[PDB]
Amino acid sequence: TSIAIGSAEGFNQADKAINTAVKSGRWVMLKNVHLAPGWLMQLEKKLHSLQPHACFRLFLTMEINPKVPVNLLRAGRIFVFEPPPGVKANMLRTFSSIPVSRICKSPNERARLYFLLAWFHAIIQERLRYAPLGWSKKYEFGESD
Amino acid sequence: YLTMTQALEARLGGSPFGPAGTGKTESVKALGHQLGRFVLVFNCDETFDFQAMGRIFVGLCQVGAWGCFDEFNRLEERMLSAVSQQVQCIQEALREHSNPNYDKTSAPITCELLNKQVKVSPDMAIFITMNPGYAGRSNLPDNLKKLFRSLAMTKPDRQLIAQVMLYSQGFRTAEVLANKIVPFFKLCDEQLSS
Amino acid sequence: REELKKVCQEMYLTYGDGEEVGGMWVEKVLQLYQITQINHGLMMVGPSGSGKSMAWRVLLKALERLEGVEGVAHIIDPKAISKDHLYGTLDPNTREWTDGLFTHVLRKIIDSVRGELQKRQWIVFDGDVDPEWVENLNSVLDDNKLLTLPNGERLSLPPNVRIMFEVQDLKYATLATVSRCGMVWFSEDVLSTDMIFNNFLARLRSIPLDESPMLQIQRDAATIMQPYFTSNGLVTKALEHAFQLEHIMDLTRLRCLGSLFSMLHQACRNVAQYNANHPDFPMQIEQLERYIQRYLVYAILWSLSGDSRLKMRAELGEYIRRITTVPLPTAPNIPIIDYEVSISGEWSPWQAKVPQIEVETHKVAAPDVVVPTLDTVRHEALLYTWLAEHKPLVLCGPPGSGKTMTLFSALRALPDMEVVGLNFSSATTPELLLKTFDHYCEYRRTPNGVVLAPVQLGKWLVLFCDEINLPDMDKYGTQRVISFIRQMVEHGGFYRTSDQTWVKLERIQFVGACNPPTDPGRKPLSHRFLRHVPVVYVDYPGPASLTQIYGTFNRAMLRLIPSLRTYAEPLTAAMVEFYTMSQERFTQDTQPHYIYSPREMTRWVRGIFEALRPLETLPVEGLIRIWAHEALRLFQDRLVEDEERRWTDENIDTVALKHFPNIDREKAMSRPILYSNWLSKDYIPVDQEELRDYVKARLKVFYEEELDVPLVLFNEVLDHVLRIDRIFRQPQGHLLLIGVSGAGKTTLSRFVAWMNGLSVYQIKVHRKYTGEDFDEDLRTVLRRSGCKNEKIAFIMDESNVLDSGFLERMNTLLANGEVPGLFEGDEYATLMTQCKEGAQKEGLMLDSHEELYKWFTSQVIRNLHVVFTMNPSSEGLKDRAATSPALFNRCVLNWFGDWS
Amino acid sequence: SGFLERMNTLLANGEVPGLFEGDEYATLMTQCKEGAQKEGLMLDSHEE
Amino acid sequence: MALEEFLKQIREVWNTYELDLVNYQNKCRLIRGWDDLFNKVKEHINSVSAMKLSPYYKVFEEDALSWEDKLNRIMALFDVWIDVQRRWVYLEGIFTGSADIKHLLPVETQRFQSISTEFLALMKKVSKSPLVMDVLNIQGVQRSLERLADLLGKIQKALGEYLERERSSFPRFYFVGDEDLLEIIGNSKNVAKLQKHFKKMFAGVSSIILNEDNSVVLGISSREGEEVMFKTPVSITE
Ligand SMILES: Nc1ncnc2c1ncn2[C@@H]1O[C@H](COP(=O)(O)OP(=O)(O)OP(=O)(O)O)[C@@H](O)[C@H]1O
Ligand SMILES: Nc1ncnc2c1ncn2[C@@H]1O[C@H](COP(=O)(O)OP(=O)(O)O)[C@@H](O)[C@H]1O
Ligand SMILES: Nc1ncnc2c1ncn2[C@@H]1O[C@H](COP(=O)(O)OP(=O)(O)O)[C@@H](O)[C@H]1O
Ligand SMILES: [Mg+2]
Numbered sequence A: 001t002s003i004a005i006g007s008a009e010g011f012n013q014a015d016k017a018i019n020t021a022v023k024s025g026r027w028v029m030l031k032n033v034h035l036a037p038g039w040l041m042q043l044e045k046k047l048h049s050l051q052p053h054a055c056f057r058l059f060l061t062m063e064i065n066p067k068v069p070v071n072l073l074r075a076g077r078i079f080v081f082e083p084p085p086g087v088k089a090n091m092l093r094t095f096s097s098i099p100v101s102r103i104c105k106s107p108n109e110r111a112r113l114y115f116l117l118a119w120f121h122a123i124i125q126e127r128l129r130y131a132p133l134g135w136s137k138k139y140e141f142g143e144s145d
Numbered sequence B: 001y002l003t004m005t006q007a008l009e010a011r012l013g014g015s016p017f018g019p020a021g022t023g024k025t026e027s028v029k030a031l032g033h034q035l036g037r038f039v040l041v042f043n044c045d046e047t048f049d050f051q052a053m054g055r056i057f058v059g060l061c062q063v064g065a066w067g068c069f070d071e072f073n074r075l076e077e078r079m080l081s082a083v084s085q086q087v088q089c090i091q092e093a094l095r096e097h098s099n100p101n102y103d104k105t106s107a108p109i110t111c112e113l114l115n116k117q118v119k120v121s122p123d124m125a126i127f128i129t130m131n132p133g134y135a136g137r138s139n140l141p142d143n144l145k146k147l148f149r150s151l152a153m154t155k156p157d158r159q160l161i162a163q164v165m166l167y168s169q170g171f172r173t174a175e176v177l178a179n180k181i182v183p184f185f186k187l188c189d190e191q192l193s194s
Numbered sequence C: 001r002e003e004l005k006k007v008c009q010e011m012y013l014t015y016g017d018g019e020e021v022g023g024m025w026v027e028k029v030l031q032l033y034q035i036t037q038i039n040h041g042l043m044m045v046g047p048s049g050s051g052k053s054m055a056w057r058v059l060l061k062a063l064e065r066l067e068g069v070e071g072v073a074h075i076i077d078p079k080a081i082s083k084d085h086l087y088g089t090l091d092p093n094t095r096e097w098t099d100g101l102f103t104h105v106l107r108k109i110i111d112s113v114r115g116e117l118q119k120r121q122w123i124v125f126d127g128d129v130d131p132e133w134v135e136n137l138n139s140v141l142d143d144n145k146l147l148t149l150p151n152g153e154r155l156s157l158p159p160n161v162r163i164m165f166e167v168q169d170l171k172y173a174t175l176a177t178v179s180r181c182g183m184v185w186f187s188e189d190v191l192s193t194d195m196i197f198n199n200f201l202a203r204l205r206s207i208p209l210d211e212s213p214m215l216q217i218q219r220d221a222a223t224i225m226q227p228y229f230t231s232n233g234l235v236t237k238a239l240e241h242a243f244q245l246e247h248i249m250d251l252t253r254l255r256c257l258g259s260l261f262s263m264l265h266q267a268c269r270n271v272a273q274y275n276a277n278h279p280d281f282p283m284q285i286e287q288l289e290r291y292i293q294r295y296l297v298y299a300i301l302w303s304l305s306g307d308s309r310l311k312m313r314a315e316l317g318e319y320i321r322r323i324t325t326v327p328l329p330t331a332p333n334i335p336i337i338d339y340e341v342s343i344s345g346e347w348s349p350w351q352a353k354v355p356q357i358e359v360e361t362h363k364v365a366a367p368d369v370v371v372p373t374l375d376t377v378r379h380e381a382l383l384y385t386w387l388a389e390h391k392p393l394v395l396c397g398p399p400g401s402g403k404t405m406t407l408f409s410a411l412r413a414l415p416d417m418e419v420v421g422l423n424f425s426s427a428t429t430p431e432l433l434l435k436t437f438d439h440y441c442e443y444r445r446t447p448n449g450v451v452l453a454p455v456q457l458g459k460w461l462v463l464f465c466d467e468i469n470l471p472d473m474d475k476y477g478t479q480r481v482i483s484f485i486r487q488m489v490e491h492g493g494f495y496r497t498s499d500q501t502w503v504k505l506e507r508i509q510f511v512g513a514c515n516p517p518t519d520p521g522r523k524p525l526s527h528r529f530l531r532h533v534p535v536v537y538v539d540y541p542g543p544a545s546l547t548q549i550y551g552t553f554n555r556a557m558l559r560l561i562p563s564l565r566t567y568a569e570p571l572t573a574a575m576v577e578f579y580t581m582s583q584e585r586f587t588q589d590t591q592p593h594y595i596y597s598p599r600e601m602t603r604w605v606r607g608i609f610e611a612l613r614p615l616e617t618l619p620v621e622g623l624i625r626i627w628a629h630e631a632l633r634l635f636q637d638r639l640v641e642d643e644e645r646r647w648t649d650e651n652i653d654t655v656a657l658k659h660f661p662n663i664d665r666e667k668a669m670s671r672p673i674l675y676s677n678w679l680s681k682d683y684i685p686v687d688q689e690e691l692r693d694y695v696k697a698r699l700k701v702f703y704e705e706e707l708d709v710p711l712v713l714f715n716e717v718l719d720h721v722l723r724i725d726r727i728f729r730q731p732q733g734h735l736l737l738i739g740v741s742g743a744g745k746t747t748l749s750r751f752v753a754w755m756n757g758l759s760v761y762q763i764k765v766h767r768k769y770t771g772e773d774f775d776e777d778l779r780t781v782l783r784r785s786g787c788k789n790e791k792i793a794f795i796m797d798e799s800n801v802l803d804s805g806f807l808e809r810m811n812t813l814l815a816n817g818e819v820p821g822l823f824e825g826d827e828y829a830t831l832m833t834q835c836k837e838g839a840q841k842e843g844l845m846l847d848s849h850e851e852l853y854k855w856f857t858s859q860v861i862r863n864l865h866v867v868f869t870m871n872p873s874s875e876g877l878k879d880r881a882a883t884s885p886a887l888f889n890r891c892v893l894n895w896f897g898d899w900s
Numbered sequence D: 001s002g003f004l005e006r007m008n009t010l011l012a013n014g015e016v017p018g019l020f021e022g023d024e025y026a027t028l029m030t031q032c033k034e035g036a037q038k039e040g041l042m043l044d045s046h047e048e
Numbered sequence E: 001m002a003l004e005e006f007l008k009q010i011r012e013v014w015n016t017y018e019l020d021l022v023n024y025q026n027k028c029r030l031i032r033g034w035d036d037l038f039n040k041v042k043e044h045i046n047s048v049s050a051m052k053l054s055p056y057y058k059v060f061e062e063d064a065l066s067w068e069d070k071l072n073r074i075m076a077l078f079d080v081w082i083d084v085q086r087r088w089v090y091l092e093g094i095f096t097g098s099a100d101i102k103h104l105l106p107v108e109t110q111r112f113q114s115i116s117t118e119f120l121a122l123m124k125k126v127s128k129s130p131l132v133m134d135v136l137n138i139q140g141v142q143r144s145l146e147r148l149a150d151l152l153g154k155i156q157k158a159l160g161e162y163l164e165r166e167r168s169s170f171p172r173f174y175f176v177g178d179e180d181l182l183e184i185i186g187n188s189k190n191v192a193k194l195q196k197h198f199k200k201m202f203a204g205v206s207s208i209i210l211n212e213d214n215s216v217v218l219g220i221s222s223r224e225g226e227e228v229m230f231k232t233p234v235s236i237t238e
């Protein structure tokens, strides 16, 4: 159950989804939780006093933002998503993201094209690390492109 | 036109961005009129909350009209994040409208809007027009930015516009007149007092 | 052009073609018309008083005459109301749309129930432009010509409607708004001073000031003043020089000109009054000419330099004497500003109207008693001139200079005006004015529209707003309440947002008071607001003036004890000296609350008098001891650091020994100076150990009766309880105890209240405490202390303040003893019932609601004492110095601090 | 006997004509309004 | 002494002026000519004021004063009235042309029936004596119209859910406000008032083309006058 945070209906939906998933063991994801720090504090307090199902998982997608409470940061496990460190890591992540079947279709040239695309991506994104020289500004060349 | 048609075929939205007066709203309206679409222009502000946008989306989906939401980044960031859900649901319904197995003899395609099932016409689209250079404007969440294909509309071709408008209005010397009037405006911008 | 000429002729405006006077303004009107023909959205941009309003009004009238199409203008101040009140609100619960002001106007035009589409409709946004409200018009000004509301509704702009913005600057509007509008730039040179003079003279000759002898007097006065109202004349040169001087507020041409015109109207009224009082001999041409010339130069001096220091007034007087040909007083060094103009047509010194009065012994240091002074009489005359014309005015000066005192003294001479006090804070919105209107005024429907007028017939309601430059200024440089007041003053009304109806003010007048805009927390007022309000600068009385006032007070005081009369001259001097030193030593740069004013010396005199009242005899030693005790209580209680208190002690020593020689130092000023009436009937000095024993016994009783919390006594506790007892015995005596938590401020306050018989009231705050709960608690305490004559100590901590609304309510309650919008509906009816029972219980014949409410306010003032406690923070104290100004003007500040 | 008169009127009619008056009647009207919009009835006339 | 002539002409106009009544679907006699009556009142008030500026006004002051009062009492009476009538016309067409609204909104239906009875009674009284002066002299009529307008406005706010359902019926109604949608539903019978509401529902349609009896939609027209004629005209009776 994926829920975007920011509206009162969103808070009610998140509460209901968590209440049903702690029992059923299903997964709940809440996006952009950094837009409600007080609700984040009360969410951490609610999460502390629970004994959910063994398969229950709550994901909190957020942006690195100092308004995020530190009690939530300590309660949960943090994974930082950022540009890959280099060209090789960028290409590895690109090849991991694309399914194997999608690259390996009936046209045998497709794979090479994909590789070229990956390389091109891995180039331009890395040039973002050199702000004035790589480009004129920090463009958001990302996974959507 | 190329970028927005690419976004439409991918069942995404279109996001022309740039400074004011570059012809973003009019370009979206012109593309909509080129396809014979009912394009509704909305001047968004901080009061365009989740429920108001949901109702507007319901109307657009049922009618099958284009929604050009100008000044989209004037919404609150929490409201933009909340509206991303409705945009994603509408785009999913539009995407499942394009599948070959489903035909118009089956049940109508609906999406989940405002806790109700709303029929989605295939002619509808969502376009957002914004100027990301204004200070104090909201920053779109990435999950909402990924639902739109963006295009930088920063420098309109004033010379060609002036030449064609003067030619179509009956001016026999339209080319010379445009070549005199556009540099004149540039000189007024760069020569008069600020 | 012919239509414009006719309209300007009928509107007392100057018309010209090309290089003639008014030619540039007429060209601007023509350009405005051309821009209207091309754009549906316009912006008339130009400095304040550049002719924009008159330009578009004359254009509207001329177009109606020329084309036969009736023109209707809807003038909206977009920043005098909230954006929700301007565009509309979508209710989050029921999702029901309520129109705003602009939305309602546009929808009414669109519907055209009464033929609104056959008229020329001009929606003029007369106010500041910021990217918050004007961007909602982006589609309206764009080729779309639509107003898109959040409820999905789309309102098309009719082809006969023009959206106009009349602004003085565009430093906050974004390019998206500037690019969408047709600009017409009115320079300040477009409106020459010659046209302003011509308009003034034409209105004087044509419009009677009464509502003909009055018209004849006006015509002769205009004939006399015509030579001076010319290009490069007396008034223009005086304005040019006065622009070089420095004023307490930024000088604008029309502020000075409007002040001068009001003075000249008052001069004509004075001539009419003289003719009425002398039916046999009306004023002749020679006398009228002399009087008018002298009054004109006097009015120029008091209008172009009435908001500056005495040095700048003297400089303007010297320059005028240098340039003018009007006969002037022949005094060698006396500046002209000290000379008034007698009705006989001769210069008369102001000092002749400052008698050396002798105040009654029982009325010393009284709030009403005003010791006449040169500055006092000059300012009273100026305020009488401005108020009599119903012109809104501003009193600028340092706190405690005498702005309120001067205003009320001037208002005593005007019996047909009743004054209502308003205390602006940083959180002040037009809602305070609206609550005052709901209380003291009434809305009535007339065939011309809705009129808001005072309930009392035949009287003018004077709204005295005391901190007009405190309210928060937006990030786009606008104070909403100042815009509201400007709308009420310029357009003579406002918009009721309940039904979006234009309400016209009747018999309502505006007086404001403020500190100089360079003071911390004070913002400079808008120029478009300042052009309507003359500003008079009320500075601190000088050492000579202070000596005069408080020597008179000390003489009237020491007449109680004849043997002390010979010490009237030194005592006052010592007072003044010490006060000056304090005001020179502790400035506001160190601490925000280090403000010393003649209020301190007035409290000094009043305290000494209250100490001397019951005593039959005293040596000079006792008088010096009382003087030192009052100095300690007034100048050392607020001090923060120890070195400041040491300085205060040693300098009290030096001042008392210097101004009172041949006295025994130890008998009169032994260091532990304590006074109390707990062990006797009089406020007499008390020994520290006997006081300690008495307080120990009273605490032993207190533990058993009220609060069982044992306390450890020490000298600071005795001093603090004495300080608290001093204030609990004063009318409208509120405390502000600043010290570390756990220092015993609340406990000592409750203990002293228990001694004084005060009932301790504390608001019981919890997690879900809201503004409504605080309003209910305020109603409860006000009903107890005002309807039941119950003395109450309302004790409140800074922790109890959960919102700025709490501080606004408390500011109003402390300053006025009443909250205008607290009791309303059924609460007001119940309050009136209880007030009637309480009044008949106290043997008073009171039945009207106005007099019942006045009695209730007096009871609250006499019975309620508010103790406010907070921690000694720096940023917090600086913030509270502006968020709740009364907390530092009506509350005695006691710095408990930490335990030493 | 006044107790029995008031109770007789209350039992027979369901209301006492002179019980609420002055500030009591105004407060009763306010509460009756709030209760009406609480029950889904839009009433503001004192008679209704 | 032309002031006396002005008084006599005003008195003659106002003692020969009568309301303009027309049958409304065999239910009552509504009023047209609101603009004519309003213009008459405005010009008479303006002439009275211009007389008040005259130097012979004193001897004709009293009478003139009386007339302005009467004129004001006329203007205050018919500013509310028109609104009342309009709010009735498009509400009577909703509570009578719809069957589910009776079952869904019983309180609103009963209240509107009461208001309709009072309005029809007052309108019959008007039809008996259509003289404007006679209608003004009805005792307690201005207060009656003010109460009628207040109650009709209160009923209007109670139709939100019904309007939402109607929007669900025809999707383009989502771009139409509550009051405009109420007007459309009420005057569905008289399509002549619908023409101003098409620009809110269509991209370029500003009006519909109708035959003489307003029963068949022959085509559509834009704001510039451009017309599109349907190949198969739409019948409103069917
Ligand atoms: N053509 C004119 N001839 C004579 N007097 C004039 C003329 N135009 C304006 N005035 C007068 O000069 C003053 C200018 O006021 P006005 O309302 O025109 O200024 P403004 O530019 O609109 O100011 P603001 O922005 O402060 O409202 C007024 O007292 C007005 O009566
Ligand atoms: N000429 C005077 N005669 C008597 N008292 C004066 C005079 N000038 C100043 N004062 C004293 O100064 C104080 C001024 O306080 P107030 O008028 O409230 O100042 P503000 O209006 O700036 O707050 C008064 O308490 C008054 O007693
Ligand atoms: N002079 C004193 N002697 C002993 N205890 C004291 C004294 N003053 C304060 N206290 C202690 O402080 C507590 C109450 O503090 P309080 O007066 O509420 O603090 P604050 O000044 O922050 O309001 C009591 O429990 C008491 O024990
Ligand atoms: Mg745009």
Ligand SMILES: [Mg+2]
Pocket: C052, C053, C054, C166
């Ligand atoms: Mg103006």
